[PDB]
RNA sequence: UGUCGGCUCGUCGCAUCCUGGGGCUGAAGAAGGUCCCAAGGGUUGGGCUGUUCGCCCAUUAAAGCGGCACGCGAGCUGGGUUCAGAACGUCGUGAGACAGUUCGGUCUCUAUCCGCCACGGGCGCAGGAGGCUUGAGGGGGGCUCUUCCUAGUACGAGAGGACCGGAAGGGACGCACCUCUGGUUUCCCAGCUGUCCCUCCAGGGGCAUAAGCUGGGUAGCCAUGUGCGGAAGGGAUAACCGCUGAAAGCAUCUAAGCGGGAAGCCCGCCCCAAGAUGAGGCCUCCCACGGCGUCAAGCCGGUAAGGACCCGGGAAGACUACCCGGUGGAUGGGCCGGGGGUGUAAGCGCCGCGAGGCGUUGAGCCGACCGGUCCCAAUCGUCCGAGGUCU
RNA sequence: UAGCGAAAUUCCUUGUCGGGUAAGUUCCGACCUGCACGAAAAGCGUAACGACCGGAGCGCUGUCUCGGCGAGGGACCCGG
């Protein structure tokens, strides 16, 4: 986590005067690698944060399994 | 702000211009003319010029006053009666006087542009 | 005056022909640049297989401006167009022969290397 | 205090009358006291007159010329203490005041557009070589 | 603390040694002392300096007595100069030497009821996409309910200019005593005829 | 009818107060060289005349 | 109780991004790390996207975070979202539906009150009146980089590279100004077209804008243009360095006391300012009631010093105020001289079949700038206005 | 199935690669991993034609750096 920067902001798309104010679209980024993943489909930040992170995990994994098996 | 310039005028170029010319023609026709305070003050300067320009002679000066006043008969008079009368009267060829009246409806301050004598 | 997005001609033979000013190198937030100043710019066109090709982000020093330069001695001088010379971080022209007049201002900036190759040091 | 003018004209003791006539539409070269690296020189400037801005003192004039493909113009304070010698070379027809229009077509037409003022041409060459013989004997 | 009155007469440019320098022309005619107020007689040190002559009939005011109190030709204007009791009965341009820097206070030109943009050189507004209603308009001024008011002194349009402006460290150029003239470094407040004062700047 | 709308009916007390300086100012007249009629300063007059 | 983002205007916080100072360092020096002090000021232009966000280019001393209804729609925008149309994927037998996309889609001339920016009227200031002032209190302003000198010295194997003291230049920003450069300059000057007219030719006007088009332009206003500002310096102080120094024989920067020390604070600079009803001070000018009021509290017509009205007029100005002038006069206007702009008038003569060309000619025309002169016009006169309480 | 395909359809998504630019969530070429194309609620394509929607370039310009001046109709003062 210490190398994973979490950024929040106003979602994009329909949602009435809700979406306009109620932001909380999560977007994470792995500083050392510079690979960010974002998500703004759910109505709740945390719900998205969980996705974002866990997804990143999946990304990095295959990136590690990539080089690991590459060697 | 920017009245550092010369005088003042209402309407628009063409208009105000024709205005001066008209009040000039009329003025040199009757001598004693009544209008508003400003219209007079400004008209005063304009006319005097034409008179002094008429104080001259050469037909060039003539044709020059023919740019403002169109009536050849009128300008003709200027170089015959008007100009000579004011011989040796350099500057101030006309007089402006305040009138006590006040045009009804708009409360306009009338005046008089009198040909000095 | 030369600002970003400005097209300058090329007074030298660095191969470049026209370059657009990407930025003016000066104080934190400059606003303009005149003869003698140096600016980051991009080559928008250049001679075939020149020393520098289209899209090369180089630093260059102004040599001529359309905006007349004021002289401390009341004098004034204005050019027909705006051009410069691609330079090195060493502040020396990447190319040699630099045709087209320059200015005496370039002299007080240390670009004598330029002025020596500049025929008309006006 | 009614000398608003003369006052400005008093400090105006920097005047200079060692300067010939020249109306827009005639080429002329001026030797300017231009300082080199550290020394002083007189870089010659050979061009035609475009602008002449008369305003009593500090009344300047401009001179544009062709230089190795580029056109360069220069505005000179008329009574500048750095104008060594302003020399006339050729006078021509004006028919204008500020003739920037030459910028447009600076070609062999700019020559037939700016004629040769034989009027001043005669007066010049004549008065020169005529008054010379007078200063002689 | 040198101090002498004068009026802006105009400005052109001279040539120092071989360089051009724009300069302003002030006129510092003789300014007769009128009242050397000491701390005993008041509380501060100063001098009343007169100026232009006068039609003795216009000054029928008690000013007559004040003038006679020091015995001087009825001047037109007279102000004070804090901390400055020199000598003689009159100050002149001899006070300033070509090289000393001076402070000149004047009355800026009145720009009448000037617009915000003209006044505080604002930004204005979009000339294109935006509604032709706010081109030269301050736009916003405050916040919502909090604070609910306006910060006192908020830059707004209105009558601007025609006030007391002090320019500083203008170097004294060529001064000609032969006519009570004085030359300075150009940029001087007030029109061509405004009453200005010239003092001693504070470099150190 | 639009945004610009008064909030309360200006008290009849404030109204009059407002019109404080609203009062007029009598014209200016002086005796004339001709009759005793009172001409406006720097002006001629009907049923009076002038000179020069 | 109008909802994103943008624009405009900001202001406040400090948990400081920069510049300021300082402690420790795994601090040689440079450069940096971390913590403390410290908002006064500053805190860029651009590519992509409705975006906020972020990514990127180029630079930067730095490209701070956050509050103000995630400030600001009676200031603006309307790309987004948030109606009707339409469509694709899509779920639904369907009608329809979708924090799933796509194209389009009406933001309302008048401000009463508070508040804020400007300006005036009234009274007040225990006499009247003119000029000049005091500074309580408040406002403004507070930025910074770069080269070189000291010295390539101290430090260092080397490459590098200091403190401190001094100089020069530049950016952004503020104030003011028109000398210069540059802009506008609505009739200042000229050229040109179509046409209608004066008057047939020449010459000349209107109209083609609210200038017909074009070439150029003083004064004025003005920035791209010019000048000048941040500072010095005194004082107190922050974190901190240190002194004398006991509690506590030693020790200790503190517990008494004392010194040094911040872009910060107070003062200094600039601007307002005695409605500072706590109405300040100075210099000068005019002075008695002349009559009722027994007293006390007041009134009345005339006055003084002096002011007001009116008039000509102003780089001052919406209005008003401000400012000079008002025949004991240059206030404006006209006229003359000049500066200035335009760029050989008109007429006549000469050359050419002719359009035209040459001379007369730097001619004519000529707004504001600078100055002169009483030809015109500020004629004349009216009102107000202490006579100053008590001990 | 053909054909087409991060598409008026692709949630993850600014997919990845190439091109255009100094820099390109848009744009164009391409791959296929098609959340959610697909053959008459037609599939793929197509000269010409749209005040249709997107991208780029040239020319040019007060759109912008950034604003300044000027004209006129209001606003402002007086009389109704
Ligand atoms: Mg919906
Ligand atoms: Mg909100
Ligand atoms: Mg919410
Ligand atoms: Mg909520
Ligand atoms: Mg969902
Ligand atoms: Mg005005
Ligand atoms: Mg017209
Ligand atoms: Mg005139
Ligand atoms: Mg290419
Ligand atoms: Mg060099
Ligand atoms: Mg050479
Ligand atoms: Mg050479
Ligand atoms: Mg001299
Ligand atoms: Mg000379
Ligand atoms: Mg040829
Ligand atoms: Mg103005
Ligand atoms: Mg301005
Ligand atoms: Mg300003
Ligand atoms: Mg601002
Ligand atoms: Mg703007
Ligand atoms: Mg609109
Ligand atoms: Mg609309
Ligand atoms: Mg509207
Ligand atoms: Mg609101
Ligand atoms: Mg009542
Ligand atoms: Mg009444
Ligand atoms: Mg702002
Ligand atoms: Mg430090
Ligand atoms: Mg440190
Ligand atoms: Mg050390
Ligand atoms: Mg080390
Ligand atoms: Mg502050
Ligand atoms: Mg932008
Ligand atoms: Mg763009
Ligand atoms: Mg683009
Ligand atoms: Mg976009
Ligand atoms: Mg954007
Ligand atoms: Mg991002
Ligand atoms: Mg970068
Ligand atoms: Mg904020
Ligand atoms: Mg909001
Ligand atoms: Mg809002
Ligand atoms: Mg709105
Ligand atoms: Mg909004
Ligand atoms: Mg609101
Ligand atoms: Mg719309
Ligand atoms: Mg859109
Ligand atoms: Mg939509
Ligand atoms: Mg179905
Ligand atoms: Mg849309
Ligand atoms: Mg839309
Ligand atoms: Mg309307
Ligand atoms: Mg109001
Ligand atoms: Mg107060
Ligand atoms: Mg104070
Ligand atoms: Mg060494
Ligand atoms: Mg050594
Ligand atoms: Mg060694
Ligand atoms: Mg050693
Ligand atoms: Mg050594
Ligand atoms: Mg070395
Ligand atoms: Mg060190
Ligand atoms: Mg330098
Ligand atoms: Mg100027
Ligand atoms: Mg100019
Ligand atoms: Mg004309
Ligand atoms: Mg015309
Ligand atoms: Mg015609
Ligand atoms: Mg007709
Ligand atoms: Mg002819
Ligand atoms: Mg004809
Ligand atoms: Mg007509
Ligand atoms: Mg007709
Ligand atoms: Mg015409
Ligand atoms: Mg017509
Ligand atoms: Mg018409
Ligand atoms: Mg024109
Ligand atoms: Mg022009
Ligand atoms: Mg001008
Ligand atoms: Mg204006
Ligand atoms: Mg500027
Ligand atoms: Mg400083
Ligand atoms: Mg500086
Ligand atoms: Mg200090
Ligand atoms: Mg110790
Ligand atoms: Mg002890
Ligand atoms: Mg101890
Ligand atoms: Mg210790
Ligand atoms: Mg303790
Ligand atoms: Mg300090
Ligand atoms: Mg200090
Ligand atoms: Mg203070
Ligand atoms: Mg009595
Ligand atoms: Mg009493
Ligand atoms: Mg009065
Ligand atoms: Mg008076
Ligand atoms: Mg009088
Ligand atoms: Mg006069
Ligand atoms: Mg006059
Ligand atoms: Mg006049
Ligand atoms: Mg001239
Ligand atoms: Mg001729
Ligand atoms: Mg002949
Ligand atoms: Mg022939
Ligand atoms: Mg002919
Ligand atoms: Mg004419
Ligand atoms: Mg003249
Ligand atoms: Mg007289
Ligand atoms: Mg006379
Ligand atoms: Mg009375
Ligand atoms: Mg009385
Ligand atoms: Mg008594
Ligand atoms: Mg007693
Ligand atoms: Mg594709
Ligand atoms: Mg998406
Ligand atoms: Mg992408
Ligand atoms: Mg790939
Ligand atoms: Mg790509
Ligand atoms: Mg690419
Ligand atoms: Mg590329
Ligand atoms: Mg582009
Ligand atoms: Mg790319
Ligand atoms: Mg394949
Ligand atoms: Mg299906
Ligand atoms: Mg389908
Ligand atoms: Mg199907
Ligand atoms: Mg089917
Ligand atoms: Mg298709
Ligand atoms: Mg097609
Ligand atoms: Mg159709
Ligand atoms: Mg269509
Ligand atoms: Mg605009
Ligand atoms: Mg205007
Ligand atoms: Mg206007
Ligand atoms: Mg108007
Ligand atoms: Mg009315």
Swiss-Prot record, chain A:
Belongs to the prokaryotic/mitochondrial release factor family. Methylated by PrmC. Methylation increases the termination efficiency of RF1. It comes from Thermus thermophilus (strain ATCC BAA-163 / DSM 7039 / HB27). This is Peptide chain release factor 1. Peptide chain release factor 1 directs the termination of translation in response to the peptide chain termination codons UAG and UAA. The modification N5-methylglutamine is found at residue 17. It is found in: Cytoplasm.
From Swiss-Prot, chain C:
Keywords: Ribonucleoprotein, Ribosomal protein, RNA-binding, rRNA-binding. One of its GO terms (molecular function) is structural constituent of ribosome. GO terms for biological process: translation. It holds the Pfam family Ribosomal_L14. GO terms for cellular component: cytosolic large ribosomal subunit. Belongs to the universal ribosomal protein uL14 family. NCBIfam families: rplN_bact. PANTHER family: 50S/60S RIBOSOMAL PROTEIN L14/L23, LARGE RIBOSOMAL SUBUNIT PROTEIN UL14M. This is Large ribosomal subunit protein uL14.
UniProtKB/Swiss-Prot annotation, chain E:
Transmembrane segments: none annotated. Disulfide bonds: none annotated. Keywords: Ribonucleoprotein, Ribosomal protein, RNA-binding, rRNA-binding. InterPro entries: Ribosomal_uL3 (IPR000597), Ribosomal_uL3_bac/org-type (IPR019927), Ribosomal_uL3_CS (IPR019926), Transl_B-barrel_sf (IPR009000). The keyword Iron does not apply. Coiled coil: none annotated. GO terms for biological process: translation. One of its GO terms (cellular component) is cytosolic large ribosomal subunit. GO terms for molecular function: rRNA binding; structural constituent of ribosome. Part of the 50S ribosomal subunit. Forms a cluster with proteins L14 and L19. NCBIfam families: L3_bact. PANTHER family: 50S RIBOSOMAL PROTEIN L3, LARGE RIBOSOMAL SUBUNIT PROTEIN UL3C. Belongs to the universal ribosomal protein uL3 family. One of the primary rRNA binding proteins, it binds directly near the 3'-end of the 23S rRNA, where it nucleates assembly of the 50S subunit. This is Large ribosomal subunit protein uL3. It comes from Thermus thermophilus (strain ATCC BAA-163 / DSM 7039 / HB27).
UniProtKB/Swiss-Prot annotation, chain F:
Keywords: Ribonucleoprotein, Ribosomal protein. The keyword Transcription regulation does not apply. Pfam families: Ribosomal_L32p. The keyword Ribosomal protein applies. InterPro entries: Ribosomal_bL32, Ribosomal_bL32_bact, Ribosomal_zn-bd. GO terms for biological process: translation. GO terms for cellular component: large ribosomal subunit. Residues 1-27 are annotated as: Disordered. Residues 1-22 have a biased composition (Basic residues). GO terms for molecular function: structural constituent of ribosome. Belongs to the bacterial ribosomal protein bL32 family. PANTHER family: 50S RIBOSOMAL PROTEIN L32 (PTHR35534), LARGE RIBOSOMAL SUBUNIT PROTEIN BL32 (PTHR35534:SF1). Found on the solvent side of the large subunit. Part of the 50S ribosomal subunit. This is Large ribosomal subunit protein bL32.
């Amino acid at each position: 986590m210490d190398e994973i920067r979490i950024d929040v902001m106003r979602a994009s798309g329909p949602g009435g005067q809700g979406v306009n104010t109620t932001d909380s679209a999560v977007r994470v980024v792995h500083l050392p690698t510079g690979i960010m993943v974002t998500c703004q489909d759910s109505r709740s930040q945390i719900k998205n944060r969980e996705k974002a992170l866990m997804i990143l995990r999946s990304r990095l994994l295959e990136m590690k399994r990539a080089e690991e098996a590459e060697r | 702000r920017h009245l550092k310039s010369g005088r003042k005028l209402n309407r628009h170029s063409s208009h105000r211009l024709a205005l001066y010319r008209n009040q000039a023609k009329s003025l040199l026709t009757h001598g004693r003319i009544t209008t508003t305070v400003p219209k007079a003050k400004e008209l005063r300067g304009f006319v005097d010029h034409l008179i002094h320009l008429a104080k001259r002679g050469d037909l060039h000066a003539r044709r020059l006053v023919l740019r403002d006043l169109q009536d050849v008969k009128l300008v003709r008079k200027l170089f015959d009666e008007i100009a000579p009368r004011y011989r040796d009267r350099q500057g101030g060829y006309t007089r402006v006087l305040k009138l006590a009246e006040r045009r009804r409806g708009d409360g306009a301050p009338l005046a008089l542009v009198e040909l000095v004598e | 005056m030369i600002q970003p997005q400005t097209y300058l001609e090329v007074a030298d033979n660095t191969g470049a022909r026209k370059i657009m000013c990407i930025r003016v190198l000066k104080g934190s937030n400059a606003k303009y640049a005149t003869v003698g100043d140096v600016i980051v710019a991009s080559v928008k066109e250049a001679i075939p297989r020149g020393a520098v090709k289209e899209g090369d982000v180089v630093k260059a020093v102004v040599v001529r401006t359309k905006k007349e330069v004021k002289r401390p001695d009341g004098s004034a001088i204005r050019f027909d167009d705006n051009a410069a010379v691609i330079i090195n971080n060493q502040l020396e022209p990447r190319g040699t022969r630099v045709f087209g007049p320059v200015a005496r201002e370039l002299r007080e900036k240390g670009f004598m290397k330029i002025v020596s190759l500049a025929p008309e040091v006006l | 205090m009614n000398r608003g003018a003369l006052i400005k004209l008093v400090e105006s003791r920097y005047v200079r009358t060692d300067l010939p006539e020249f109306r827009p539409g005639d080429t002329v070269r001026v030797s300017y006291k231009v300082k080199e690296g550290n020394r002083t020189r007189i870089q010659d400037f050979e061009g035609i007159v475009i602008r002449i801005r008369r305003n009593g003192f500090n009344t300047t004039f401009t001179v544009r010329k062709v230089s190795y493909g580029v056109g360069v113009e220069r505005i000179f304070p008329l009574h500048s203490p750095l104008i060594q010698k302003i020399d006339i070379v050729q006078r021509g027809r004006a028919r204008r005041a500020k003739l920037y229009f030459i910028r447009n077509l600076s070609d062999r037409e700019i020559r037939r557009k700016l004629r040769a003022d034989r009027k001043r041409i005669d007066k010049d060459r004549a008065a020169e070589r005529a008054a010379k013989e007078e200063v002689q004997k | 603390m040198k101090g002498i009155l004068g009026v802006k007469v105009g400005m052109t440019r001279i040539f120092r040694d071989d360089r051009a320098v724009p300069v302003t022309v002030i006129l510092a005619g003789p300014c007769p002392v009128v009242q050397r107020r000491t701390p005993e007689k008041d509380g501060y040190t100063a001098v009343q300096l007169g100026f232009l002559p006068q039609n003795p009939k216009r000054v029928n005011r008690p000013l007559k007595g004040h003038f006679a109190k020091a015995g001087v030709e009825p001047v037109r204007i007279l102000r004070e100069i804090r901390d400055f009791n020199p000598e003689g009965d009159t100050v002149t341009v001899e006070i300033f030497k070509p090289g000393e820097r001076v402070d000149v206070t004047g009355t800026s030109k009145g720009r009448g009821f000037a617009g915000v943009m003209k006044r505080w050189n604002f930004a204005g507004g979009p000339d294109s996409h935006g509604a032709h209603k706010i081109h030269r308009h301050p736009g916003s001024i405050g916040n919502r309910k909090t604070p609910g008011r306006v910060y006192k002194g908020k830059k707004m349009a209105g009558h601007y200019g025609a006030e007391r402006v002090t320019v500083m460290n203008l170097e004294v150029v060529d001064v000609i005593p032969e006519e009570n003239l004085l030359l300075v470094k150009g940029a001087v407040p007030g029109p061509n005829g405004g009453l200005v004062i010239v003092r001693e700047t504070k470099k150190a | 009818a639009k945004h610009p709308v008064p909030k309360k009916k200006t008290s009849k007390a404030r109204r009059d107060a407002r019109r404080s300086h609203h009062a007029l100012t009598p014209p200016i007249l002086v005796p004339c060289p001709e009759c005793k009629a009172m001409k406006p300063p720097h002006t001629v007059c009907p049923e009076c005349g002038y000179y020069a």
